A paper describes a structure:
The crystals of the product complex of Q32R hmFru-1,6-Pase are isomorphous with the wild-type crystals. The model includes residues 10–54 and 72–335. In the Q32R mutant structure, there was no visible electron density for the residues 55–71 indicating that these residues were not ordered in the crystal. Replacement of the glutamine by an arginine residue creates hydrogen bonds between the side chain of Arg32 and the carbonyl group of Ser88, which helps to pull the Cα atoms of residues 28–32 between 0.6–1.5 Å away from the center of the tetramer. This change consequently propagates across the region linking the α1 and α2 helices to translocate the α1 helix of the Cα atoms of residues 14–20 by an average of 2.2 Å toward the center of tetramer. Furthermore, inspection of the quaternary state indicates that, compared with the wild-type structure, the C1–C2 pair in the mutant structure has undergone a further rotation by an angle of 2° relative to the C3–C4 pair. Thus, the tetramer is in an intermediate quaternary state which is 5° away from the canonical R-state and 10° toward the canonical T-state. One F6P, one phosphate, and two Mg2+ ions (M1 and M2) are found in the active site. Based on the electron density maps, the F6P molecule is present as the β-anomer, which differs from the α-anomer observed in the recently published T-state hmFru-1,6-Pase structure.
The enzyme is a primary control point in gluconeogenesis and is important for the regulation of blood glucose. Fru-1,6-Pase is regulated by two inhibitors: AMP, which binds at an allosteric site, and fructose-2,6-bisphosphate (F2,6P2), which binds to the active site. Each subunit of the tetramer (designated C1, C2, C3 and C4) has an allosteric AMP domain (residues 1–200) and a catalytic F1,6P2 domain (residues 201–335).
Numbering used by the authors:
A (entry chain A), B (entry chain A), C (entry chain A), D (entry chain A): 10 to 54, 72 to 335
Write the structure that this text describes.
Amino acid sequence: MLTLTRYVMEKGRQAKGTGELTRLLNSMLTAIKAISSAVRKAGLAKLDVLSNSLVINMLQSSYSTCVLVSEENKDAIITAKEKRGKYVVCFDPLDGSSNIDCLASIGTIFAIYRKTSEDEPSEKDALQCGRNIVAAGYALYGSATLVALSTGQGVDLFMLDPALGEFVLVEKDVKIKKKGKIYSLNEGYAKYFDAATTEYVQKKKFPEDGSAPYGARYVGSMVADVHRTLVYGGIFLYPANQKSPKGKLRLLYECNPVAYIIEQAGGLATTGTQPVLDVKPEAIHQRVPLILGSPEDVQEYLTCVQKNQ
Amino acid sequence: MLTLTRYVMEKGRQAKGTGELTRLLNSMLTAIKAISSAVRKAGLAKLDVLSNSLVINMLQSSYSTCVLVSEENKDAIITAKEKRGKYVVCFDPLDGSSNIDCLASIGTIFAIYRKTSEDEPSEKDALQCGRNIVAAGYALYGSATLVALSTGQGVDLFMLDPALGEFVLVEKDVKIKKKGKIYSLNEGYAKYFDAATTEYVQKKKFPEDGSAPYGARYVGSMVADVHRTLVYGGIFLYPANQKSPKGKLRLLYECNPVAYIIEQAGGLATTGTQPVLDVKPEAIHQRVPLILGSPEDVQEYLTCVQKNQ
Amino acid sequence: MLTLTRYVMEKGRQAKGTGELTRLLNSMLTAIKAISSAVRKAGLAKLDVLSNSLVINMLQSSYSTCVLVSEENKDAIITAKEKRGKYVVCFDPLDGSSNIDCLASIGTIFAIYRKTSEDEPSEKDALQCGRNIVAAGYALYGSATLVALSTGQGVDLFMLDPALGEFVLVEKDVKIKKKGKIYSLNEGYAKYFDAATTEYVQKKKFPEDGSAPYGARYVGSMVADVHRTLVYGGIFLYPANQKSPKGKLRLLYECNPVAYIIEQAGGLATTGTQPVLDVKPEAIHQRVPLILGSPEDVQEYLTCVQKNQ
Amino acid sequence: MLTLTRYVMEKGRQAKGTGELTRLLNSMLTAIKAISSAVRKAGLAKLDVLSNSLVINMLQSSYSTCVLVSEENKDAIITAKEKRGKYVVCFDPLDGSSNIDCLASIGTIFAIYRKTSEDEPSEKDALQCGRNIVAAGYALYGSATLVALSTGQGVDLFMLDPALGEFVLVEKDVKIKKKGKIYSLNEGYAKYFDAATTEYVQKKKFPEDGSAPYGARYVGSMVADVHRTLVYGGIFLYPANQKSPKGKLRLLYECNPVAYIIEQAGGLATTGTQPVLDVKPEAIHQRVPLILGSPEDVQEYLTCVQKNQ
Ligand SMILES: O=P(O)(O)OC[C@H]1O[C@](O)(CO)[C@@H](O)[C@@H]1O
Ligand SMILES: O=P(O)(O)OC[C@H]1O[C@](O)(CO)[C@@H](O)[C@@H]1O
Ligand SMILES: O=P(O)(O)OC[C@H]1O[C@](O)(CO)[C@@H](O)[C@@H]1O
Ligand SMILES: O=P(O)(O)OC[C@H]1O[C@](O)(CO)[C@@H](O)[C@@H]1O
Ligand SMILES: [Cl-]
Ligand SMILES: [Cl-]
Ligand SMILES: [Mg+2]
Ligand SMILES: [Mg+2]
Ligand SMILES: [Mg+2]
Ligand SMILES: [Mg+2]
Ligand SMILES: [Mg+2]
Ligand SMILES: [Mg+2]
Ligand SMILES: [Mg+2]
Ligand SMILES: [Mg+2]
């Protein structure tokens, strides 16, 4: 039984670390477990508020953090001097608000950076390119609870063993298919799509090479849809549209973490004009377009962008 | 704490029943709990086979059944003479095979009939119109575990309390909105749709009255998509198409139960030409088209069918 | 998987009952499960008050009761006319107060009678001899959670399956050994014992026939000590002493239920002068001496009583 | 929520450790959780064998150990060179065999030492006086699951939060009463006691100063009885007797750990002639007499030893 806590401590032993990142991850994972439990019994009772407190408190108490960015907080949270550590965490404590009442899969998203500037800790420490991620992942609260995690050496999948109360490694170093057979976007925005998105979607439904149309899936929780894309392959799209000209999804704590996971699994994640991880953030709640998945599907989307530009 | 077992026994006390239906439901619910538990720890290990055995064994042992129809069994299962009861159960022991690996919501579906013929128990006892349902419902194994149940007096929702190990009533007599704002179908089959489906879908994305386009959602597990339709309103479609000319979804143990639930909640469920519950089944594994949800959305779909016929 | 709910409903099907006792037992068992859960997480927070409310509410709501006697209530609780059923329940909702802080096994004890008088329901309906018990048992909240139950056809043991959230039959028709090798009493009261108890205890430690002395065990929760006596054999004693001249243990909701269980398993349960189940109660909180266990050990205790009288 | 994993990592951050002890404790605690779960569902199925494997595998995999002593293994287990760490663990993976069938509290016991010799790792590294313990504690699998732990700075109590799946600090720096009112030993061995034990026990039942006799408690699992002694005060005795002239309890992995806990809480733990922690072990499965608890009660026992020597 390779537990996440035993896996992470072991990974930190081979790298001769001080144990600070390990302490941070353990704290994050503890918050995730409390969130999983609250989610499993939610209807028997706001959850946004609770999951946000849980994450902030656990992270700050780890003595590993200097700056936190949460979806739930207008401004960056600076860690009190007495608990100052070297890491910056951007997180979405509970994503998939739209699906809570209807019991669909929802999740938690996070990315961890090392503070590199010499200055006093500020929001600017949270404005690194995703290419500078130290660790990132997500939890999926679905038919079972799962964490996808990467620290730069590929993507590992862990599942909450409910009897044992701990995360157990179920898949090591997962790789996305080069090409899938599923496309995933909200086609309710079709009226507002750019020409590139329209053309790409048309190619999926009416291919010109005799292949079967792709199947469509859209849970409407990003973590569920991205996780499906990871394990089954294909493409997930939340592009710019007329109602959301800069996209809807948030760069720091939605797009960068999933982009990091998808790239680590051998996939691609793009704004349409450049890799998501290469976008230099200008503000903590900045939005970007997100198109991600199997490299050949994303590469085909990029061709549509290129001939329509 | 109004538990499902206490709710069902109480419902049977006011109706002066022998307790046979109550015994049947309790058995079904016990199978559901075992399924929930196996689902929650699935990745840590086929599940179709297991959930099928669980349901068959629990139902047969209730002394309440004479005939069972399962998705997993070519032929109807006749209950051994010594355990013969008066009820017929059609069930899908685990639905949403496509979503198991990716951890999306999956479910169990069932409908219960009283055997009305005088003959020896046979498959023909399972070929009643859904309009003759005595009890029907589904379990949803999602971020939490839920059962929707009706015995003819509206739809009640129950949630598995994990600490207590029992189903607890969370919503009594639920009603679907008259009109929703979500449409749900696999648009990957667009190339194969009939004119009516094409036109309806076009109206959702490009309305002609100045209203916002509907949002699209499609989990790709029927129970998840139908449950969302129930609680948020809107429309779910699995119509006939060129690849599935009679539809894909199964009449006895997929469509009739959800149709029964949706109608009990004040919604509509149609094949496109008639109510699902009014279809006289000719074979236990018969397929039908399924269009269901908020009455005004379904009524609008039926208008598209009518002007394209 | 023979669950308690399926076992009890089945037992009621063969006996052509109205289902009223079955509804009562299910309710009692639901309270037991809630108690088990509260007990498992007690230190992470009175419990007497909670467990009492749980039992009273569940029993009254079953529409099966007319009179309740609780250890926690000075007077008998008469069921409101609208929920009147035919049964009387005497219960100790949580026994083993002394062991809660130190985490030793604790339990719940109950006996069920049919009201036989024609009069208005009163405390007098709870003053039947234990010989008139319809059903009785206990729950043990120990290293695992167990229920011992009898309805007149021997003793069955059930264990809470934590994954499944239900009681499962683990042993059918259990029989106590004719003679054991363990004696169980608080020897701290030795100064206050009568001559009979003194002599019996001396015989256990200094036998005159060359046999090994009995081992001593005393958890100090009656349910734990009685359950051990049931499965390992031997003798449990809470006799009269100078500080408690009529004994300490309560007749209605401590002694009668365990006496009923022990007798059903082929054991004996005595006051020292007569079987516990044959004592005609005069008051709802009456105390009796309790000596119970393997028939040959109890029979040997009775010989000490006889030669010292 | 101060979790054990967060508490232990934090305790290791202030002490600038390499994290090796922390990794060891986490591993031990993970084994404890698996044991708790197996114990909670034991009757629904040897456990000695399982719990032994769990502990050995978890400890060896921590890269923190060089030598293990288990009750279940004749010889010391030398850690393979590739996983060699600096610590020695003596453990009883599951104690209280006698109480498993009857569902009474049972436990796991452990003591951790730093290897101090320069030689190749051998059994001799496990023969340090308990006074050289680095960390020690026990788990109690009772009505709830608890760990008592000390690393030299007093005794902390943790409880398994079943919803959260982790140990949570419930009491910091616990102190035993100076004098209690409970004595705990198997009085079935009275025929075989030495004069000192006889006299001490007589004083508890027949005091000569007008005080009330002590109450007697004896669960017959050492961990349960010792834990009760810790939280309620009093005295626990397993002295030498004619059948067990050197005592029964094992020095390395039963007596030293509980002695360490009791001393850290301000109590005393003696063989009758010297502190348990000061005994120099000569063999890994050596037995000693054990008398422990509130200092004034133990001090009174020692006076009986002294006037009978
Ligand atoms: O309804 P829409 O516009 O498709 O938005 C759904 C998206 O919004 C989110 O809830 C976060 O903004 C994602 O989880 C999901 O992908
Ligand atoms: O991939 P498709 O064709 O959309 O099929 C999905 C449907 O199939 C099912 O798995 C059952 O056939 C449903 O749960 C779901 O609605
Ligand atoms: O401390 P004593 O006098 O031995 O009393 C213990 C007895 O009291 C009870 O807590 C109930 O009165 C029983 O569970 C137990 O047998
Ligand atoms: O039956 P006895 O001799 O009192 O032995 C009980 C003791 O044995 C053990 O099981 C371990 O030897 C302890 O847990 C307990 O204190
Ligand atoms: Cl989902
Ligand atoms: Cl106990
Ligand atoms: Mg969010
Ligand atoms: Mg979000
Ligand atoms: Mg199926
Ligand atoms: Mg199906
Ligand atoms: Mg009580
Ligand atoms: Mg009591
Ligand atoms: Mg042992
Ligand atoms: Mg032992």
